[PDB]
């Protein structure tokens, strides 16, 4: 099938870093806001050469004209939210899940949590829980995925290569698993 | 020819050779270091201007006219700036403008002589220097006067010996990097900021921002120029003129510029700028009201009547003084004009004193006691002086009201007259027509207003002023408020009529404009009754006369042939569009089928023209409508054309951002194994089925390809997998769907039309080519490329996707002529530096690089990113430097154009009034400004479009976007578009600068609040002539203010109706028939007859109905397609909550009180209007025909209420009240109190009506027996808030330990319950009477709203207390929202009760334009059972809540009926807290002579 890969998120949330590491192999220290574009990645799936339609677009409301164009017919959406910031996750449940359900019709949906390396940073957690928030864990993300009826919660981080290989191979294979 | 610029190059009379122009441009670039590529672009621009200008006049005349237009002429912005700043002649220019409606003449003569002495090379040098500066200005282009100052400095530098001495050229890019770059940095810093190496947006009040205009204004006045200081501190003025250009870079701008126009609350702006409207309306209303109120000015006299009317002039002077104080507030004191404001205030106060003096003399009671004829004559003369004052202040503009008298040394005018007051006066019968229209409007308005005032209020004023009531009243002040109750009713009535007095004027304005439009239609003679057969019969001759320039060319051939060729081209265009059938096209074509040997057989007139009945056109075809409109346009008078080679050069500008270039094959055809909606290709087919079917079935494409000649006498897709077929499908879909490619084709029709005209008019070229068709095509294409240029701006090209890049490459390949302008970026040479951004242009001719990107023809470097603010204006600005020609056409991303509209392009350009006029020397010594006829150019041009009535209404909606622009005029002044964040702002800037705006009906194009604070509105309202001012005011702001006044009058009428209903209910009234004598003994003895008051209610209902109907005719008219023959619930409610839903409900409650208190037929109309207002969103929204749908929506609403209690959620009630608080969030504090005051007035009025109800009018007066209703209001108002505070404290400090979202919802429910309980307690206290309770609860709600507004106002001026107040207000808001939604759902219930409303839903679907069907996906049985369980649960809960409320309402009434009323044991000052009497007579009448 024509499976599309979509990465969304607010600015300076780690999208550019992991995206450039996976796409080409460099870690940019600068966060460059991506408006709307697509990259190609060669991943071996089932012993077959698969090219990934790595659609990219910033999650800001200013870009509501171009970002919805490629959402349809997408298997895995990499909603980039900070683990240490549950407000971003609440915004994911509030708006992004609704939009993904709105566009992704008849295609499996996978929820992805970014920044696995900074899952439990005490300083940021303390400075973001001053307003009465809670820590976010892998089980918390899986709970969110279960509530929204997602086909799976796979965490990948191209910064250190965690997950990306197996997670993306499974995403290609999720078109058949369902 | 064979030259890039044939007109100037070929003529041997040209004074300057192209090589000399190139040399002078290069010399300027060397001396000032303009970018070489920018120099090349501006050299091309200047040569194109010379070619276009010289094509229609002699070369030297063309160069002279260009010099005059750009710098030297009276129409040159540089001259205006030079006189405003260097010569400091603004006040003299204001003097001259006022008259038209050492010394200036001497300076103008010196300037003209200086210009005349110039040789042609010097004129070229001046123009080239200006054009280079303008090209390099970049963002400074919007601040035109800054550009003019930089140009002055550059000229001074160049002419100085120091510049000539230097032998080392200035480094390339010095201009941009030194002069423009600092100013761009200043503008950018005023908006944005940098964080962590990333550029972030910064927001501040616009009062704190220094925008483009504020930067611009500093250069208008010489004092503003003097404020400029270098970094070291020395003033820029101290330097000699030759040194200034070099030192310009050394200047620091941040502390030099400043804010010139300061903005504050809206009502201050409305008072200041529109002062004349308020003066005339209010003063005349006072005079009418004074003349008609004998009781008010008569003790227990003609002199008093006349004197009281003279107060109208005093009111006018007061309005003027208040407007002057607001004006003083707006502008800073140091800036030029403050001293004039002080003097104007002094003059106005003196006039006020003069108006007051004699009136105070007459007022003196000792003078009245001994009547004197002197006092009577004083009163009369004072009245006439007051009328003169009202006229004078209604006519004269506020700006420079007394300026002529002063002749002051300082600057007399507040605003620079050269740039703010230069309006082009109306000339000829047009100005007289405007005078007559406005005189008619005001005469009719005042006559009608006096008729209505006398008729409606002559009796009510008498009755309510002279009638005194009988009641015990409240304990604290029982006596004092019943005796004035009718007076309060009368005051409210007068206020309501005062508001209505304004709507009358807009009504009359619309009526009179309609009548004048019909009159103009009669004068023109175009009548719908005229047979269309006649218009079509005359069409060929009209085409011969107008579409072709035949008088210019020698008449060697019959007209028949030329018009036949034009019509054949038109019809072949139609056929290529596929809108016409082959047979129909054949009937519409001048037939050449018969033998060409015989002249008659060679050309045969179309069947379509000769016959006129037969279906020549397919029914409901765009082609038939287009042809009919073409004929209609040809009927009207239009300017004569001129030969194509003589036509001026113009350009078409198109910006876009993310628009779809061409339809993707994926969009057209989709995968088989899916189901969603209907395939878009088939949807479009259904849209135009015949058009789609004809060309595929009959192969009409190739048949039309052959017919165009007419013998020369004139695996993705399952159904197909042929590439050419895919291209054809994509082209067709793009043509029939909104697409950029459709606009590109429609506007290449311009080039096609120009080619056609050049071929038709000049057969000599065709003979010369002698059958060489390819060479003929090449030559015609040369002409088309020379005359017409298409430019489309794309700021996205650097970031285009592969498919978008492919689409753009296809676009360029289709039309090699086309031009594109885009932006590209590069990294800096030094590390740690901002990226470098250039602007580039490409057209199809540019060779394609190896990497696939097209080579840029021009690169221009910009100091920074051109998109400083989010708006289309900057997108246009970064690209227009590449425009060519003398005229520009603006279009948005999507528009449609046709060959017939293109043929008339020569006429459209002609109406700018430059082509057909004779040329004279603008520097002749004898000529004088007053004698010149070129003072006011045509800056902008706009294009516009039982049966007679519909035409009237269409004109009504039409009357009120620049579609063409005078390139030079708008380029030198400001920019083509100046949103600087819209079109109206650009048009108003053109009007202020001095240009004119014209509208043409022969060319039609299809396209598919904050203003009140703008400085332009202030200038226009403060400085326009009276008639022009009225035109402007009732065009643009009149609509908004009329709507606001409609809402205000609705609220005021509801308040008056509440008070009047209370008065009627508590009183006993007496009615009389018309036959029965007007003056007679009252039918019941001792009765007050208030029937005229309810008659006034009826009259007011009729008046508001008329106004609403007139305001609604345009909206229904817009739905012409229907013709005369014919969703989240919570999100929707929040959307329209605060949009007159809360006000709608409150007014509905007041109307219900009035309805129960008294019944009058007009209130039924108000009931219908309010019900429509409340339920409109809930009736026109879809999915209504489903019980499950309603229960899902109700569940979503309950979730919306519950969300945010424990964990914040954006889509929740908490979030929305937070949003409202945020949107609400010294002297400005006083302005805030100004808005809170009206709410206090409404609360007081409702409270007074409530007190009326409880005053016990008809009951026998009982000594020391009184009812403390005000204490009732106090208790019922404080108790809910007090309980909210108590429960909040309890939750905060109690039971928190015993933990085992529910708690917050519990608190909200408790607050709701307490509100309901206190409403019940109010009903109990009223003794279970329903009407007194209704008014009491309305008053309680008003008091709570007033308290909340007071708390908010205090918050805007300790933190835990503030948060506590916010929480409390939010709790009350939750209670209100919950009850409102609950009643909404109650009203929803009956619709659900109906077994099947499918018929209503189907009718609604027919009404709805989209007409779309949607079906839900399949669901699992367990999930379906869960959904059914949820439906059962939530419907049960909804019915439970409904039953709880229904019991809460009815049950107390049943209990009260069951248990008899009783009152007892009231002491300690609180007497009869519960409403005193169980039984009451309330009927005092008869009683022989005695009353009461």
From Swiss-Prot, chain A:
Location (main, coarse): membrane
Enzymatic reactions: GTP + H2O = GDP + phosphate + H(+)
Effect of residue 37 to V: In RHO1-2; temperature sensitive, fails to activate PKC1
Domain of life of the source: Eukaryota
Annotated EC: 3.6.5.2
Outcome of swapping residue 37 to I: Temperature sensitive growth defect
Entry binding sites for GTP: 9-16, 56-60, 114-117
SMART domains: RAB (SM00175), RAS (SM00173), RHO (SM00174)
Family, as annotated: Belongs to the small GTPase superfamily. Rho family.
The protein's role, per its UniProt record: Acts as a central regulator in the cell wall integrity signaling pathway, which is regulated by the cell cycle and in response to various types of cell wall stress. Integrates signals from different cell surface sensors, and activates a set of effectors, regulating processes including beta-glucan synthesis at the site of wall remodeling, gene expression related to cell wall biogenesis, organization of the actin cytoskeleton, and protein- and secretory vesicle-targeting to the growth site.
Name of protein: GTP-binding protein RHO1
Organism this protein belongs to: Saccharomyces cerevisiae (strain ATCC 204508 / S288c)
UniProtKB/Swiss-Prot annotation, chain B:
GO BP terms in the entry: (1->3)-beta-D-glucan biosynthetic process; ascospore wall assembly; fungal-type cell wall biogenesis; fungal-type cell wall polysaccharide biosynthetic process; positive regulation of endocytosis; regulation of cell size
Effect of residue 661 to T: In 1114; temperature-sensitive mutant; lower beta-glucan content of cells
Function according to Swiss-Prot or TrEMBL: Alternate catalytic subunit of the 1,3-beta-glucan synthase (GS) complex. Synthesizes 1,3-beta-glucan, a major structural component of the yeast cell wall. Involved in cell wall synthesis, maintenance and remodeling.
Extracellular side: 366-376, 456-491, 1182-1231, 1357-1436
Highest taxon in the source lineage: Eukaryota
Protein name from the UniProt record: 1,3-beta-glucan synthase component FKS1
Cytoplasmic membrane side: 1-276, 327-344, 398-434, 513-1100, 1157-1160, 1253-1272, 1326-1333, 1458-1492
Subunit structure: Component of the 1,3-beta-glucan synthase (GS) complex, composed of two alternate catalytic subunits FKS1 or GSC2, and a regulatory subunit RHO1. Interacts with RHO1, which is a GTP-binding protein.
Induction comment: During vegetative growth. Expressed periodically during the cell cycle.
Cross-link (Glycyl lysine isopeptide (Lys-Gly) (interchain with G-Cter in ubiquitin)), chain numbering: 208
Membrane topology: Multi-pass membrane protein
InterPro entries assigned: FKS1-like_dom1, FKS1-like_dom2, Glyco_trans_48_dom
Keyword terms of this UniProt record: Cell membrane, Cell wall biogenesis/degradation, Glycosyltransferase, Isopeptide bond, Membrane, Mitochondrion, Phosphoprotein, Transferase, Transmembrane, Transmembrane helix, Ubl conjugation
Variant or mutagenesis effect after changing residue 685 to N: In 1154; temperature-sensitive mutant which is able to grow at 25 degrees Celsius but fails to grow at temperatures above 35 degrees Celsius; defective in 1,3-beta-glucan synthesis and thus has lower beta-glucan content; hypersensitive to echinocandin B and to a chitin-binding reagent, Calcofluor white; fails to grow in a low glucose medium
Deleted gene: phenotype: Cells are hypersensitive to immunosuppressant drugs FK506 and cyclosporin A (CsA) due to the inhibition of calcineurin phosphatase activity by the receptor-drug complexes and is dependent on calcineurin for vegetative growth. It confers a slow growth phenotype which is partially suppressed by exogenously added Ca(2+) and exacerbated by EGTA. Simultaneous disruption of CNA1 and CNA2 or CNB1 is lethal in FKS1-1. Disruption of FPR1 or CPR1 results in the loss of hypersensitivity.
GO cellular component entries: 1,3-beta-D-glucan synthase complex; actin cortical patch; cell periphery; cellular bud; cellular bud neck; cellular bud tip; fungal-type cell wall; mitochondrion
Outcome after substituting residue 418 to I: In 1093; temperature-sensitive mutant; higher beta-glucan content of cells
Location relative to the cell: Mitochondrion; Cell membrane
Top EC class for this record: transferase
GO molecular function, one term: 1,3-beta-D-glucan synthase activity
Enzyme Commission number(s) of this protein: 2.4.1.34
Reactions that this protein is recorded to catalyse: [(1->3)-beta-D-glucosyl](n) + UDP-alpha-D-glucose = [(1->3)-beta-D-glucosyl](n+1) + UDP + H(+)
